[PDB]
Amino acid sequence: PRYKADIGGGSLKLPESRIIAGLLLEGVTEDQWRHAIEVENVLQRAKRQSSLMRNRLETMGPELWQMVRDGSTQVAIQAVFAAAIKHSTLLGDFLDLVVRDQFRMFRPDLPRKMWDQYLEQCRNRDPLMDSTANKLADCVYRILVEVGYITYRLKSVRISGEVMSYLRENNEQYVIRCIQVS
Secondary structure, eight states: OOOOSGGGGOOOOHHHHHHHHHHHHHOOOHHHHHHHHHTSOTTOOOHHHHHHHHHHHTTSOHHHHHHHHHSOHHHHHHHHHHHHHHHOHHHHHHIIIIIHHHTTSSSOBOOHHHHHHHHHHHHHHOTTOOHHHHHHHHHHHHHHHHHTOOOOBOOOOOOOHHHHHHHHHTTOHHHHHHHOOO
């Protein structure tokens, strides 16, 4: 299936993502990964959300994990954003096919009907595709608030040169196209 709902499990959540990026950079066995999250309680609380944040980062490599763990607030959040895009065609295609064209308006906005109608299109496009839907929409817009794209008025956001260099150097065509749409 082209579009899946996994992205709805949680927004970028930088603080937690930094801890997970640490664990990725240290190197632990899978059993130890689960122990650190669930028993040692490294996130200071469950399981599904941490799997998502990890699955997101594991689409990318140590260089970007190091950015998440060590970088400034904006650099780290944007690296997490790129990972979220790579992990989710549903998010990436929202950016690519809807958000990008909105920035053609004067005073671009992104009202919820636009998400609704995008989902209508996604269904059309993917023959293999309530409470989940609502949490889903909320999560996508929260991501966009976190990165700074969102009156539902849209604003342009400059992706850090450090993140963009990583993406170019790693051939991340699709993330590149979706991450910068302003």
